[PDB]
Cullin-3 (Homo sapiens), 20 residues
Amino acid sequence: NSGLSFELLYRLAYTMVLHK
């Protein structure tokens, strides 16, 4: 469990929220 799909899933997200 590297969390590759659980780390871009929380940062690509948090980044898309600030820009919206």
Notes: DSSP finds one helix and no strands in the chain. The two ends are 30 Å apart (CA to CA). Helices lie at 4-19. The CA atoms of residues 11 and 17 lie 10 Å apart.
